[PDB]
Write a structure and sequence with these properties.
Elements lengths: L29 H7 L8 E2 L9 E8 L3 H17 L3 E9 L7 H15 L4 E5 L3 E3 L13 E2 L3 E2 L15 E5 H6 L13 H11 L13 E4 L9 H7 L11 E8 L2 E7 L5
PDB class: transferase
Keywords: M339H mutant, apo enzyme, transferase
Assembly: monomeric
């Protein structure tokens, strides 16, 4: 007998089911999704009741006018994240306006704003249109920067090239800070993920990946390696989290996610 703390959650969750059937041909009603996921709290926050997870994860989704894709993302990922026993929150970073979309800058915004809410220590950066096909593909951080979407159906279930880091990735707070976050000036130029990969390598990090069999993803309807090595080395410490500027225009907590609408400026 005696007062005692809740145990850490196990290394691997015993709740995982493995393969999942992913389809995008039926309607989704978020009110029904919330009712089927009653343990997910306002703003799309969840943590296990019976154990403490070492994975305090902010899932950051760059976004603009793709509500149907987001509804599928929520419908599929909330059950998966709870089965993975993560202490997580969902952040949809909505780019205000009509100017060119800037994926990497919105991801940086997500890192900085999610930290205002809670002491997250792991960050998953996910396009809104990528859904995992196996729940053994952990949505959390590892000893090295994690590439999650490693075998995408749109690329024939094969990695485009070994240095490809697009789609869905995860970086611990330490990993993200040491590369000064992501570049802010990729205004649809292409290759922002290759720049991120170059930053990680320059800092001595490598890429961790799940086994490809469980790393498969479906895309809701072959890239090549843009080169920028010298450029990334030149600019990574002066363009990134330290130089990030934006204005928060709206913050909405919905039952299944927090949506932060931001004005990130225009190409300079």
């Amino acid at each position: 007998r005696g007062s005692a703390s809740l145990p850490a959650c196990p290394e691997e969750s015993p709740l995982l089911v493995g393969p999942m059937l992913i389809e995008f041909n039926m309607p989704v009603d978020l009110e029904l999704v919330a009712k089927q996921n009653p343990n997910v709290k306002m703003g799309g926050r969840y943590a296990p009741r019976d154990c403490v997870s070492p994975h305090k994860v902010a899932i950051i989704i760059p976004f603009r006018n793709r509500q149907e894709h987001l509804k599928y993302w929520l419908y599929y990922l909330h059950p998966v994240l709870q089965r993975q026993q993560l202490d997580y929150g969902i952040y949809v970073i909505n780019q205000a306006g009509d100017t060119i979309f800037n994926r990497a800058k919105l991801l940086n915004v997500g890192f900085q704003e999610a930290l205002k809410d809670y002491d997250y220590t792991c960050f998953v950066f996910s396009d809104v249109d990528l859904i995992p096909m196996n729940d053994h593909n952990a949505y959390r951080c590892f000893s090295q920067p994690r590439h999650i979407s490693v075998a995408m159906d749109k690329f024939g279930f094969s990695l485009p090239y070994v240095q490809y880091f697009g789609g869905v990735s995860a970086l611990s707070k330490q990993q993200f800070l040491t590369i000064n976050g992501f570049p802010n000036n990729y205004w649809g130029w292409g290759g922002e993920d290759d720049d991120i990969f170059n930053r990680l390598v320059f800092r001595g990090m490598s890429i961790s990946r799940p086994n490809a069999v469980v790393g498969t993803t479906r895309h809701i309807r072959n890239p090549q390696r843009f080169d920028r090595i010298a450029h990334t080395k030149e600019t990574m410490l002066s363009d990134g989290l330290n130089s990030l500027t934006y204005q928060v225009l709206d913050v909405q907590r919905y039952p299944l996610y927090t949506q932060i609408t931001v004005d990130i400026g225009t190409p300079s």
